[PDB]
Nucleic acid binder design. Sequence first.
DNA 1: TCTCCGAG
DNA 2: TTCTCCGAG
DNA 3: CGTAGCTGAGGCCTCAGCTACGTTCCGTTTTAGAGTCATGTTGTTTAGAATGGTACCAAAACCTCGGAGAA
DNA 4: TCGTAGCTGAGGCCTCAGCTACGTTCCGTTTTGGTACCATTCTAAACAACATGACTCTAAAACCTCGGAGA
Lengths: 104, 102, 286, 288, 288, 288
Amino acid sequence: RYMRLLLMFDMPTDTASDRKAYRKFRKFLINEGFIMHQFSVYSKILLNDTANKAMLARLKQNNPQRGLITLLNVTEKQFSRMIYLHGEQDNRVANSDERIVFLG
Amino acid sequence: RYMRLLLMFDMPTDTASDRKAYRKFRKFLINEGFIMHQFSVYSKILLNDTANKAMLARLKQNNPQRGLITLLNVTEKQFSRMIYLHGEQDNRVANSDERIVF
Amino acid sequence: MGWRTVVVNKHSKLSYKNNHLVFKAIDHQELIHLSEIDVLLLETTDISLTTMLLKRLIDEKILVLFCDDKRLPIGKILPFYGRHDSSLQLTRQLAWTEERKGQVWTAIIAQKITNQSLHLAQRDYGQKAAALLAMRAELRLFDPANREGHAARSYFNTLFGNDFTREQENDINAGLNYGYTLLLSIFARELVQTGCFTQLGLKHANQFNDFNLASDLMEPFRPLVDQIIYENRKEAFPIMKRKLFALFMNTYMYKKKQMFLTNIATDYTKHVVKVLNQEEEGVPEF
Amino acid sequence: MGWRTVVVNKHSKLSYKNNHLVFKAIDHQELIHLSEIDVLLLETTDISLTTMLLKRLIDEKILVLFCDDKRLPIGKILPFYGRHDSSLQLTRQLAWTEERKGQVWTAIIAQKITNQSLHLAQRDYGQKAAALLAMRAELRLFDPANREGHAARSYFNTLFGNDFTREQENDINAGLNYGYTLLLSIFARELVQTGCFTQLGLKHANQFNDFNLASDLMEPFRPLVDQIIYENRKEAFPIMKRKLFALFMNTYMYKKKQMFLTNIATDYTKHVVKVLNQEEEGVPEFGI
Amino acid sequence: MGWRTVVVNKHSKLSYKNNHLVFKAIDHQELIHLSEIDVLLLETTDISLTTMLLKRLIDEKILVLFCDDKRLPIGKILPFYGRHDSSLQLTRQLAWTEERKGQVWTAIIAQKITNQSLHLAQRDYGQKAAALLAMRAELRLFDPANREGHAARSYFNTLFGNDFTREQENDINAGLNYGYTLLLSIFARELVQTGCFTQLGLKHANQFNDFNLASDLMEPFRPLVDQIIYENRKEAFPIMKRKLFALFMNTYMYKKKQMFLTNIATDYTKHVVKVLNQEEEGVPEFGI
Amino acid sequence: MGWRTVVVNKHSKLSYKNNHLVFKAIDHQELIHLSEIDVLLLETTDISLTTMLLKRLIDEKILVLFCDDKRLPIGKILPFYGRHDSSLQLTRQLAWTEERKGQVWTAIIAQKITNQSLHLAQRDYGQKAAALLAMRAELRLFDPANREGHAARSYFNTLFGNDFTREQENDINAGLNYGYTLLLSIFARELVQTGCFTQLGLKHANQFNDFNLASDLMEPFRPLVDQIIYENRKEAFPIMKRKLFALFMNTYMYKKKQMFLTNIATDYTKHVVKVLNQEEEGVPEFGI
DNA sequence: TCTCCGAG
DNA sequence: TTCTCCGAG
DNA sequence: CGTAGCTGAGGCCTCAGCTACGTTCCGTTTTAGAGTCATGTTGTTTAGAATGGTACCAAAACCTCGGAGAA
DNA sequence: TCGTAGCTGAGGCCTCAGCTACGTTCCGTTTTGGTACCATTCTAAACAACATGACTCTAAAACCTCGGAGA
Ligand SMILES: [Mg+2]
Ligand SMILES: [Mg+2]
């Protein structure tokens, strides 16, 4: 039943005002447990649409209202299929789905 | 009733050699009819896993063998539901699935 | 294959770049990958385009159509070399027996009149439909009888009334004619790619019209046009125009497959030609 | 109809005004009344044109022809309402008798070999030239004992040495190949203007060769290429390239007239076709 | 809710940042969002952590467990304030009648023995299972003739043989003990969050120990532990440990719903307390 | 067991060595034998500590307490094997008679109003002070006619004018509020160390107030706050803040001894509880 | 005396 | 000097 | 008119490293509204393989034999 | 050896506009093997999208006792 939200952004850095509302937005994301996969492209792991539907609201609430920002929901099974054409996958537990974890 | 491939990349800019293989790659992508949907993040429309399965090969073929490059397949139906938090839709016909066009 | 039907009606310059057709209007702009493209319609007379574009348009099996001051199709592009091995398939076309040509042409005209009845049956003329299947049952190779004409007469007089035979210049005939033009062009393209002359019709070699063989091949498909136009019979011509594009949008049961139309014509045409070279008997049906 | 054959090979924009085809190049500019025009050839890929123009080009049923990057015909415009004379010319081509095809092809191949010897003679091979004329004298229709092939072999072996082959990767072969393709293109173009299908050769008959008929027609001209290439046989390929363009710059004795080359091939091709349809006898002849 | 069970056994420093637990080992490093976490086990005695972390670990419902030199649980964190309104639910707990306490406690112990027989039936002891259901049938409030004890004895003597005690220090008892501790901790947590004292058990107030009420509540869940450990009865203790964690990984048929374990215990606990406050009759049931 | 109550509120690392708790601050450093220790209070969120230390802390069954960003108790360690004497203290708290509760609360509230008077006298309201001592004299158990409230209003209206309210958004009310919260925190801390639940007040009994019992206990101390705040009544809020910290810096006459404040509240709290369990009479008294 | 406001 | 076998069409 | 390939301007996006910041109730109970969260259930996608193929391009095969090189 | 928010600037990513150099290299035919193609249908299996029926908080107003600054 697990699900994965994917967020992609292209946000203007032209002005002081422009950047502020950027940094706020990246922090928001960090604080919400989002993983950075590529520069300007972050993944949030979820567990249910109800978790998803919630996390949606949170984003609407902290919408920077600048740039291009885009949200795509898929499944862990689908996200798992994603192919690395070069470079390696992130080992971070954050990115895993293991219910158990071992720091060693 | 289509598919949509989605390509994300993070490619090293440090050296002459590093950038060359970059451009090559982007060109390859443009030439293969890919839409740039964000900086460093491009979408290819497809109609068939058979189309997909092929396009994969082509990519394996022109692998820059640098950077982090990532491929994710979804469906048109899924892609359609993607929500734009902000900024207007990508209305270029290139990005549509309408089989009639103006 | 290619899937899009691209329509231009704005004062503009068309170009080529990196496998993309390039569309510049005064303020709006669009690139489109050619591989996606199945058809180009140039509606207006305010359109510029490059020779390179045309080359590449030809390189892909793209059907290009050209239009009047009044936005009607006056012509299309005709490529010479539709294969690596044009020559091979041409010599076979020439070895086509008079006999086979008949069987095959008459099998096609047969399909024309079935579809005509099935369209009439569809408009609740259960009896004029049966009356057309009678004309089908009786005829011979290359229609001595002119039964094609007799079915066609009762077909148009039953649909649009006893006082119209389609010679008059109205919104309806304009509609069908535009429609008919379209289908011809499909087959014209597919023929060449299979490696045939379109001028050398199964009945008439190029006496007048350079698109005889395609005109022969399309015959079973016209009713598709007639459906749309009948359904919009009471609409103003420009409405009829957009409604016809349905043909490309839509799918049709062909060989147990639901298939798109140009992809149907591809297989349809090839398997027709295969019979005329006597690589197989049977004929495709619709 | 109209009488002009208008040929474009300069980076240019074509337009329509006041019943005139409008030609803009950077420097030069030309208007031409459409009623005068019979054919439009677009040789190059650097040409821009309006859909208005095309409408009107169709209105007059002018024949329009389109060319690839290498100046070969790839297609033409096919109106729904109407035709151009050329359309008829196909049925004649099909009505070509097996016998005439022979006579005409064999006449041409005779010229090829004559010109081959004349070239050898030019390079002080008094005897091989003569040896070739012998081969020529024993020609039967469709060269069944392969005289053409045997003349050719001794031709290349004498010119470039008994070690040389045609398939080996040299600056020489590249040179001739480039040369040959040029010539072919010319005839390919001139053929389709008459209304012929290049695929349907007199003897050539190759599946994969879309230009058999042109390959048949060009045969007598090859030695022109061979001269240049031989005279630069030493030189690096790029030098050979520039020297070949001479063909278009220069003039040649064709019919007691000193004529430019495309203009030759025009008349040459036309009068060959004419014979095959049997509208005349007297095959054209071309002598280096 | 929170789903992860994070286990630490490497010399390391734990910290807090931006809602993330922060794990530093020498080479390796990890961040993990707290929302995701359900349990923190600190296995080893080489671990450093911050007070802030703990605060935030408490702020979320996260069960933290602490361990001996020999990697055995010795303790848990016990928050005071499990709700906005801790006080409200405490006063009700105190208003709990002696009689109700009995009915409810005895209902639970019934479940304990039902599950004990079902486990026996699962290992092919068709008859001892049945023999236990008899003991169940023949009891009264606060099990005065210790039938819970008589079932339990034949339970452990049938499973692990007539010479096994449950008092003896072996890899089996260690295993169950570890297992049992785990379960108690869950209910300890869910109780507090519900707003209860864990010290005030239904039969025994905090006479001997401070987790009496949780010990009373967990009784029906022990056989879950017993299954795992039996299935690994002959494995060495550390293997038994890892196998127990299953409890969190898995799901169990609770209430026509296949649910995860902590989520079960949440609803289970709540609906029990509701009965003891007399907000409802019925008692939750849990069946293996 | 041990006798010491060890309180940490400096950015620091705690460690274990040779049976000693090890305290490192940047400059200062301390070792303390564990056998001596009875309680560990962690006040701040800037403290680091090892799992070995915690093991050994639990081995001794020392009571460990944890605190939030605002220095309030949020939780404690709960060992599975063992207890600390504080655990017992709960059952005593529950055995607290309705009557005793009254006597003790009312004694406290008497001190509140004495100290309120003494403050008004201090500011030259010879008469309002006296008017407050009258209210005091008329106190019945659990102040049923609300003497507390009526003294309190005339207290604030006299100090800060008959315009003033407590609910209005001033620099003053902020000042007091901040002040009040501080004091409460002290008593919350000292209570849980005795082993009491702050949720269960003597009179306070508010669902949403987790710290009723501490809010009851602190009542006599408020005027300390009120002094500082009034002396700075003019000053902008941040100035009030810094001035309040005086409370910890200073000393006050508690029991014929000039004592520091947290040490007062320690002894104060303890000896209050003791009375409630009836282990002594003689409630403590605090006079400003 | 009378009536609010509002401390707890 | 008769022989094979290359490679132009 | 087009490809190929390069440069450099300037807009994106991070990170390490600065700065300044850090305890604001206490009469209790009701009520209303906006946050939680975890499961099962609908008709409907969907991977992924299977099915039956076409289009191109070289390499290697087939041709006749007059002559260069072998013997 | 605690955490937050927020800002700065170096330098790494990523794009675009704007330069440069460049642009027809077969013609004995046919057969055969390899590497691309391409549009369909069919299968269990996966999914999204509610529906279910809950529980957790927080503010604001509702409730209480009456001495008092006042009409
Ligand atoms: Mg980006
Ligand atoms: Mg990128």
